[PDB]
Design a protein around this ligand. Structure first.
Ligand code: HEM
Ligand code: HEM
Ligand code: HEM
Ligand code: HEM
Lengths: 141, 142, 141, 142
């Protein structure tokens, strides 16, 4: 459960990401594929080489979805219901993998936005990504 | 476990870590981001806010010892379960630190390295450090 | 996130517990102390011997709280805010321990109510206890 | 790990387990309660509802083999990491089963034993079985 302070923190941080959200999404996916190679088993038909245009386009989709999760942070089950259908019903992604991509996103934000990534923001972002992860892995519709 | 090129990567970056500061920044963030870990450090004094935690002298002095032990691990990457044997005893026998927490500290340390080195903490370098902090977390679990 | 079917399941099952909720709460605590002895470190001033009256009284309090969580399953953060203050702010219970007591409660319900504990109900109860656990371990107020 | 009185408890109850049924009931509940585990059994056919899962013949036949291996573990409680070595290879090399899932199946099996034996699955008996299923989960993790 997010505090009201957590929500202000996440809105402010993600706002700073801005028009770089695509490139950050792509970098986080590349970090997750390289550090945790079992995650590649969910993307068999993808080209997952470095600089792949499929990863670049997927990273953009993942980022746009998080932007939308941020704008509906009070009503996330309802704003993410189609992604949830895809991740929990169709793909059956093991919940452990959400912890992995969450970590790779925090690492990406720490490397690129060091002044924004204070301990208070780090703590809010971490709670936000856990809550997004819980909605994506639950069948509730 | 590590490739000779991975070991060289891990070593080169570690030569540039401030060993007076990074250990504290990591222990500090662990207490702020996963607040139940504050229970194990009740004797350290004021941990009431993030600014309090990050400025606590005792958190800084203890983070130095934690980072000292990670350094000893990087010097004995082939024999981690021996380097950390006394230390596994202590975290299990005297405290009972649930081993999930060791994995959380390792991941906070990777974020702090990312934060300090920026574009130099490339995906290949991160993937080498993930292997080292998983190594250390496993040798601590008792 | 609970489905609407999950909520019907939990209400019906817990309803069957009835006036035995106290004795079930106490049995679950005794199972958790015996199977996972590190959990005793949170109760230093308790008598934790078998048949202890302190465990019996605590088991009753834990059960009454779950009854209330069930009756406010749509608004749990608000119905459990004082327990959350106690578990997350004051006691700092490590979240791993909530998985342990959740398992000991499922085992207690399986041993006593075998006809109610079908696979569908088991799945709903498990999701309910994870959601109660997430509210108790979060600082959001 | 187990006390001589714990080993006797674990053995006596296991003599009364239906070995044609319990393995299936456990694998069945794993797929219903933690539905992402259905990904590893796509070849088994219809897993669309709980009634479908619990009636699937292939789930029943596979649960028999899982319970067979738990039985082999209870006969070699002192040498679990040897009994399960081939089996750790298979779950990691061919499938990649995240080791958290091994802990989930062990806990579903304890619930199914509770369900079958009722008041005979006392807290002391449960505490002996928790030690055996943690044992088995750890020897499978690769
Ligand atoms: C914050 C976490 C995540 C977000 C926001 C997210 C978001 C998305 C989005 C927006 C899509 C594409 C939806 C569409 O085009 O219809 C997608 C597809 C997908 N996601 Fe995720 N995802 C996340 C985590 C994960 C993780 C952890 C995995 C696996 C390790 C995963 C595997 C997939 C796969 C396999 C696809 C389908 C790709 C394709 O078939 O083209 N996702 N995700
Ligand atoms: C994961 C890597 C970790 C390493 C390398 C590490 C290392 C250390 C070291 C070197 C000491 C001091 C040993 C001594 O002076 O004799 C220590 C003590 C301690 N550690 Fe850790 N530790 C780790 C994780 C954790 C975690 C996750 C917790 C708690 C959540 C924790 C809680 C403690 C506590 C309470 C002490 C005793 C401190 C005191 O009494 O002042 N450690 N650890
Ligand atoms: C569903 C999970 C849980 C529920 C519903 C629950 C509920 C409660 C309730 C109602 C109280 C007493 C509140 C009061 O009298 O003011 C309480 C106190 C407490 N709980 Fe929990 N609890 C749960 C899980 C846990 C777990 C997992 C632990 C530790 C392993 C724990 C440790 C405690 C302690 C130490 C107290 C204080 C006892 C005392 O000081 O007298 N609780 N809990
Ligand atoms: C925890 C105790 C477990 C034991 C004792 C166990 C035991 C077994 C055994 C005996 C086999 C068949 C080996 C053979 O015939 O050569 C097997 C296969 C398999 N297990 Fe497990 N297993 C366990 C957990 C899991 C878990 C948690 C999963 C997935 C979530 C899983 C997925 C599989 C799959 C997919 C196969 C191959 C089945 C097939 O190809 O039809 N197992 N396991």
């Amino acid at each position: 459960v997010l505090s009201p302070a957590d929500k202000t923190n996440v809105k402010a941080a993600w706002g700073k990401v801005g028009a770089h959200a695509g490139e950050y999404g792509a970098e986080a996916l590349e970090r997750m594929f390289l550090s945790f190679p079992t995650t590649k088993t969910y993307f068999p038909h993808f080209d997952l080489s470095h600089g792949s245009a499929q990863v670049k386009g997927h990273g953009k989709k993942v980022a746009d979805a998080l932007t939308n999760a941020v704008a509906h942070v009070d009503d996330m089950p309802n704003a993410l219901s189609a992604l949830s259908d895809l991740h929990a019903h169709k793909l059956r992604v093991d919940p452990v993998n959400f912890k992995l991509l969450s970590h790779c996103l925090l690492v990406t934000l720490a490397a690129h936005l060091p002044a924004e990534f204070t301990p208070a923001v780090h703590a809010s972002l971490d709670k936000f990504l856990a809550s997004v992860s819980t909605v994506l892995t639950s069948k509730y519709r | 476990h590590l490739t000779p090129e991975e070991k060289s990567a891990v070593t080169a970056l570690w030569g540039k870590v401030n060993v007076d500061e990074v250990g504290g920044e990591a222990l500090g963030r662990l207490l702020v981001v996963y607040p139940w870990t504050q229970r194990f450090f009740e004797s350290f004094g004021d941990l009431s806010t993030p600014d309090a935690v990050m400025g606590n002298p005792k958190v800084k002095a203890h983070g130095k010892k934690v980072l000292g032990a990670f350094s000893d691990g990087l010097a004995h990457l082939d024999n981690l379960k021996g380097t950390f044997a006394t230390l596994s005893e202590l975290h299990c026998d005297k405290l009972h630190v649930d081993p999930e927490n060791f994995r959380l500290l390792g991941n906070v340390l990777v974020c702090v390295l990312a934060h300090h080195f920026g574009k130099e903490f490339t995906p290949p370098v991160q993937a080498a450090y993930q292997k080292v902090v998983a190594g250390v977390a496993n040798a601590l679990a008792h």
